[PDB]
Design a protein around this ligand. Structure first.
Ligand code: SF4
Ligand code: SF4
Ligand code: SF4
Ligand SMILES: [Zn+2]
Lengths: 160, 89, 118, 135, 186, 89, 209, 182, 49
């Protein structure tokens, strides 16, 4: 229980940010064909900065608690091995695929948004377990964080 | 005198127990932005340029074509590969 | 020797040259049975022979990997095996022949449901 | 132990009005805190802010006393609603730039499950007229 | 650090290439960890510690919030500074309403003005998307900030124009504040 | 009760023998107390000099779209949107 | 000098274009047409019989190596004698490119199954079978997926009312939920959003018979 | 429509009492039965146990309420998984035809006094999918709804406000006091 | 002053995205040896008890 609750504390901060821009907790309509529906309120940049500032602490607290824990490790590790070939022929993708070993990802290969202007590395596993898949998700959180660093630092002015 | 914190003793033990130097998580008015802000002006766009700005010579929806038939394209006129080989390995 | 293939299930395979050579031989014969005027044939020989000619010059497996590109040997053998099945099925399919069916008029026309001038 | 914390308890407990006036406040609000009278509501409510706490606790309300324990979420009036949500940083006492029109009603609770409840009804006078035999 | 097990190029990070050493100090470390549950002790002390962080529960309904000026909640039909109804029955709000939760019937009031007779919203079909207010050309209808509008009976949710006007009257001050905040920005 | 007697400005009262009255035996029939027709009537008709005036009703982008109203006719001229009234004389 | 208008990847258009001709001249009996949609994707229009051969050809041959089968998208178009159209949108990790295969069929004739080619498709065929009624031959188990049990008709067809024919409630006489003929509190109000003025000349006479 | 009293009116008025019944009871039996109802309602009001049905999209808010920002066990609310031990059911998300018999079955397997909160528009009136061939238009057509929490989804504050409103309904329920008349 | 959301002067300090373990108080040798020492003293005290 404790991991879920500690993280759902921080989920509240992020939803508040969605609320700040769009006006809805979830289910914004903020992204629209001609770009985003609306501009951003001033200062939301800074609040994002402190939130990102603290998120490393929060994520590490749960990470140190739960990644190494024997019960969790044995409870997930070597569960449902997903071999590489079997993964492809079944039409997988995402961190599942990326965990099984395939070095594929849509951001790096078929970039669609400003990801051209951000440098970062995806995580990859080599065991195809639920555990190393879980690790891949955890490292993805960390890597996304630096992506916010790049973008939020370089944000240009202009129309929206 | 700035943020409601547990008394200094419990703070020190708390830092000890965690094993990392602790930084506060609750959000205070001081910590977060000036919560009432001046009115923003959104800078005018580049197509709002006032002249030489014809829609006909910058529009996309009227620019797209129907799909072309490649065989018939040739009839009008290095083993080929869909794209740069990726070492998905 | 490389410790791991980096992928689950895909194990490190020794004698890759022997396996690759053997696979290339069989597929070449498999296309041999094909008719001489089949585009599938025309290209498979040149592609496979290019591969099966690159197989030799680079005794080092890593050197061969760079020379052939297209991925690592462990997957590469699987690519070859796939094509073996393709040729056996291809011979059984006779796809070099001409059109089985002509699409009905207005089949592949978009947008639909619009009157026309005769 | 009591590192200038029992002192703070003495402030809130004593100046509340004694054992009775600390317990009833605690008994009703399930917590006792210290702030400053931001502004007295038109309807007996009293608003308190203190930057010592954080955003959840920054601002709070002591509902009107005559509401014994029937406090409700809707008791906040319109002019104070925005401040209470950290939606406007301008206390209504301070910004007189908001409209002061006449037709504005006075506040009301979620009048539901009671004879005062709203209930919908058609807002179009009938469509087709029936022929009248007398005329 | 132990060496890797698969050599990695850039643009990637393998999260398991690190080797589990067989050095005696390394095995005895792991053995001692299992024999005395050091890792559990680390996690155990964490939760003890994290008692000593102050909980972040808002004492609702006394303490409450925060929201933002754009919050989409109770609907309201505003009135001009004179008190006249802003809505002119242009019917765009209905035409855009994704849920088709809006029904409108308009005629001429005796003065000859274009105004609604029936104006209905079903907040059991509305999605509080705000497309209606983004479309209305005179800011007639707005997603007022109230969100505690909870009813014991389903019928009580189908608002008609009388209910909507009442909310506008009730909430006019706050709605005025938000629009002054966002009109030039929206 | 008066609640189920009042005439909605739209002009509806349930007939005295109409079963749809029943729905209010236990709930109020909300009827608004401000009738736009009366209010705009009270507002006096503004007057100007120029043949053609302009109204936005409200203010800036907080009102209705800017509209130009000619006043050469003898009578009043009602703003289409806001119902404001103009008279040149 | 038109920042609003995007500029596709031209070199990608080059490769897909030449490769598309490769496919056409390698599978003459099946490939009916190969076109390059302006969105840079590549479409391969085949006759119903060659479904598996095309897919098997693609997933296997070196130059294709299109392993992943993203989905089986079903399209319905009355006024086409055999209307129900199918789309097999594939990916190729080796070359980092996407391809689309398309075929047609009526509401009666069956259709080849991709279960034997890509294990990924198994559920999709079940989905189209439920949603349109396009039978699939050799499919292992053609059980319905989405619609509830004992559901009659396949709703995604365009000759099927939006709200369906029946709707459920609960009975006290029978302590059970019963399906009843439709009855709507407010009939779904369409809006007739038809353009009177042709906003697109380029597609007017192009693609004529 | 009514409105709150003004400052001076509040000054005249006394305490609003605690038991919503009041303290005007005539005889010993009346006064005694008033207290026992108050105790019963107090028990059923303070401790209420949702079932966590939570089909969809709305469910995320149904979890955020459990989250530590608007703490709900603070009020005495706990998520018992087993419907035999759950006292309240927060139906949240859409009710498709496949689900309709399931919801019915879960509802009546729960023992009473059972109260249902219809959270979200999808449950209230079918929400955004109202004209769909597969959705139960509302959940009023399967079960007796008690409290409606409008929203899509309702902000967590709105949800637990409704919970308090259910507590008020649980507070004013008259069972012993009015059995005496029965 | 600002008219639109932009980063402040000097940009922003890099966000930390690096794992960091805590103090590693003991090692296999230290832990076990200390355990046996405690047990040995415990045996003696029980003897005297
Ligand atoms: S969009 Fe505004 S003015 Fe037009 S009908 Fe709707 S509420 Fe009235
Ligand atoms: S918020 Fe969206 S769904 Fe609700 S009435 Fe407005 S337009 Fe319709
Ligand atoms: S009512 Fe809104 S939040 Fe709830 S399930 Fe439906 S769409 Fe999602
Ligand atoms: Zn006007």
């Amino acid at each position: 229980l404790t991991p879920f609750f500690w993280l759902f504390e921080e989920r509240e901060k992020m939803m508040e940010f969605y609320e700040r821009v769009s006006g809805a907790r979830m289910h914004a309509a903020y992204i629209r064909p001609g770009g985003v529906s609306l501009d951003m309120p001033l200062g939301l940049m800074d609040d994002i900065y402190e939130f990102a500032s603290k998120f490393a602490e929060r994520l590490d607290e749960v990470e140190d608690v739960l990644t190494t824990n024997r019960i969790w490790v044995q409870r997930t590790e070597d569960i449902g091995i997903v071999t590489a070939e079997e993964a492809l022929n079944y039409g997988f993708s995402g961190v599942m695929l990326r965990g099984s070993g395939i070095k594929w990802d849509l951001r790096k290969q078929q970039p669609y948004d400003a990801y051209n202007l951000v440098n970062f590395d995806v995580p990859i596993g080599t065991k195809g377990d639920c555990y190393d898949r879980y690790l891949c998700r955890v490292e993805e959180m960390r890597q996304s964080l630096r992506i916010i660093d790049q973008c939020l630092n370089q944000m240009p002015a202009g129309e929206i | 005198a700035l943020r409601r914190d547990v008394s200094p003793l419990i703070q020190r033990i708390r830092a000890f127990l965690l094993g990392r130097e602790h930084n506060l998580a609750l959000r205070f008015e001081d910590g977060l932005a000036d919560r009432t802000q001046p009115q923003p002006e959104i800078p005018d766009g580049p197509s709002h340029l006032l002249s030489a700005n014809y829609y006909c010579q910058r529009d996309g929806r009227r620019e797209v074509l129907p799909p072309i038939d490649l065989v018939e394209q040739q009839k009008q006129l290095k083993l080929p590969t869909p794209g740069k080989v990726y070492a998905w390995d | 020797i490389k410790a791991s293939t980096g992928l689950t299930g895909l194990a490190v395979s020794t004698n890759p040259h022997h396996t690759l050579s053997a696979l290339y031989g069989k597929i070449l014969r498999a296309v041999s049975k094909m008719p001489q005027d089949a585009s599938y044939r025309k290209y498979t020989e040149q592609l496979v022979k290019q591969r099966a000619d690159s197989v030799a010059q680079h005794k080092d497996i890593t050197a061969l990997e760079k020379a052939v590109g297209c991925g690592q040997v462990e997957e590469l053998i699987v690519q070859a095996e796939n094509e073996l099945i393709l040729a056996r099925k291809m011979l059984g399919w006779k796809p070099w022949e001409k059109l089985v069916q002509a699409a009905p008029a207005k089949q592949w026309d978009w947008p639909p449901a619009q009157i026309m001038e005769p | 132990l009591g590192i200038n914390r029992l002192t703070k308890l003495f402030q809130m407990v004593r100046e509340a009005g004694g054992l009775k006036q600390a317990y009833l406040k605690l008994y009703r609000n399930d917590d006792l805190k210290i702030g400053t009278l931001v502004g007295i509501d038109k309807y007996g409510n009293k608003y308190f802010e203190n930057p010592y706490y954080f955003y959840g606790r920054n601002r709070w309300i002591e509902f009107a006393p005559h509401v014994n324990m029937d406090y409700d979420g809707s008791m906040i009036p319109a002019e104070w609603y925005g401040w209470m949500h950290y939606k406007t940083d301008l206390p209504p006492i301070r910004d007189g730039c908001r409209p002061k029109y006449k037709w504005i009603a006075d506040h009301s609770e979620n009048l539901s499950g009671t004879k005062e409840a709203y209930y919908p009804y058609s807002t179009t006078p009938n469509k087709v007229e029936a022929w009248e035999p007398k005329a | 650090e132990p060496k890797d097990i698969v050599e990695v190029p850039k643009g990637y990070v393998y999260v398991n290439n690190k080797e589990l050493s067989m050095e005696f100090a390394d095995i005895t470390d792991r053995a001692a960890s299992t024999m005395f549950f050091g890792e559990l002790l680390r996690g155990f002390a964490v939760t003890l510690a994290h008692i000593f962080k102050e909980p972040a529960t808002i004492n609702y309904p006394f303490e409450k919030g925060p929201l933002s000026p754009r919050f989409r909640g109770e609907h309201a039909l505003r009135r001009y500074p004179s008190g006249e109804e802003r809505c002119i029955a242009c019917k765009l709000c209905e035409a855009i309403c994704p849920a088709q939760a809006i029904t409108i019937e308009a005629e001429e009031r005796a003065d000859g003005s274009r105004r609604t007779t029936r104006y209905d919203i079903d907040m059991t079909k509305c999605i509080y998307c705000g497309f209606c207010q983004e479309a209305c050309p005179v800011d007639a209808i707005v997603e007022g900030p109230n969100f505690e509008f909870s009813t014991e009976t389903h019928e009580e949710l189908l608002y008609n124009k009388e209910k909507l006007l009442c909310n506008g009257d009730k909430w006019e001050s706050e709605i005025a504040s938000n629009l002054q905040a966002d009109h030039l920005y929206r | 009760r008066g609640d189920i007697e009042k005439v909605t400005h739209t002009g509806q009262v349930f007939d005295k023998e109409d079963y749809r009255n029943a729905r209010f035996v236990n709930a109020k029939r909300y009827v608004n107390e401000n009738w736009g027709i009366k209010l705009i009537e009270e507002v006096p008709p503004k007057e100007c000099t120029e043949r053609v005036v302009f109204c936005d009703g409200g203010d800036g982008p907080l009102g209705h779209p800017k509209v130009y109203i000619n006043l050469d006719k003898p009578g009043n001229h009602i703003c289409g949107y806001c119902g404001l009234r103009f008279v040149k004389k | 000098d038109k920042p609003t208008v995007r500029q596709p990847d031209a070199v990608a258009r080059s490769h897909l274009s030449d490769f598309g001709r490769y496919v056409a001249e390698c599978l003459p009996k099946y490939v009916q047409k190969v076109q390059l949609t302006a969105g840079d994707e590549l479409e391969v229009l085949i006759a119903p019989e060659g479904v598996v051969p095309v897919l098997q050809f693609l997933k296997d041959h070196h130059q294709a190596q299109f392993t992943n089968l993203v989905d089986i998208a079903g399209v319905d178009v009355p006024c086409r004698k055999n209307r129900f159209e199918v789309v097999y949108n594939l990916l190729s990790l080796r070359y980092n490119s996407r391809i689309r295969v398309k075929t047609y069929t009526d509401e009666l004739t069956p259709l080849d199954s991709a279960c034997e080619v890509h294990k990924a498709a198994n559920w999709y065929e079940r989905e189209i079978w439920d949603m349109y009624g396009v039978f699939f031959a050799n499919h292992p188990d053609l059980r319905r997926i989405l619609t509830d049990y004992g559901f009659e008709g396949h709703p995604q067809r365009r000759d099927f009312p939006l709200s369906g024919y029946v709707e459920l409630r609960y009975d006290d006489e029978k302590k059970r939920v019963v399906c009843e003929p439709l009855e709507l509190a407010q009939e779904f109000r369409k809006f007739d959003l038809s353009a009177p003025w042709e906003q697109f000349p380029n597609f007017r006479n192009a693609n004529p018979p | 429509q009514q409105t709150l009293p003004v400052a001076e009116v509040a000054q005249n008025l006394p305490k609003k009492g605690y038991s919503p019944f009041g303290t005007k009871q005539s005889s010993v039996a009346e006064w005694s039965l008033a207290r026992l109802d108050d105790l019963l309602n107090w028990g059923r009001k303070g401790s209420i146990w949702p079932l966590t049905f939570g089909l969809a999209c709305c469910a995320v808010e149904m979890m955020h309420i459990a989250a530590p920002r608007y703490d709900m066990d603070r009020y005495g609310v706990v998520f018992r998984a087993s419907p035999r031990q759950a006292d309240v059911i927060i139906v949240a998300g859409t009710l498709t035809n496949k689900m309709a018999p399931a919801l019915r079955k879960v509802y009546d397997q729960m023992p009473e006094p059972r109260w249902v909160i219809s959270m979200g528009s999808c449950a209230n009136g079918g929400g955004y999918y109202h004209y769909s061939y597969s959705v139960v238009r509302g959940c009023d057509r399967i079960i007796p709804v008690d409290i409606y929490v409008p929203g899509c989804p309702p902000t967590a504050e709105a949800l637990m406000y409704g919970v308090l409103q259910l507590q008020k309904k649980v507070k004013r329920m008259k069972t012993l006091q009015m059995w005496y008349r029965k | 002053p600002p008219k639109q959301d932009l980063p402040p002067p000097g940009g922003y300090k890099k966000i930390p995205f690096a794992r960091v373990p805590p103090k590693s108080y003991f090692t296999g040798f230290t832990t076990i040896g200390t355990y046996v020492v405690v047990t040995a003293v415990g045996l003696g005290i029980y003897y005297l008890t």
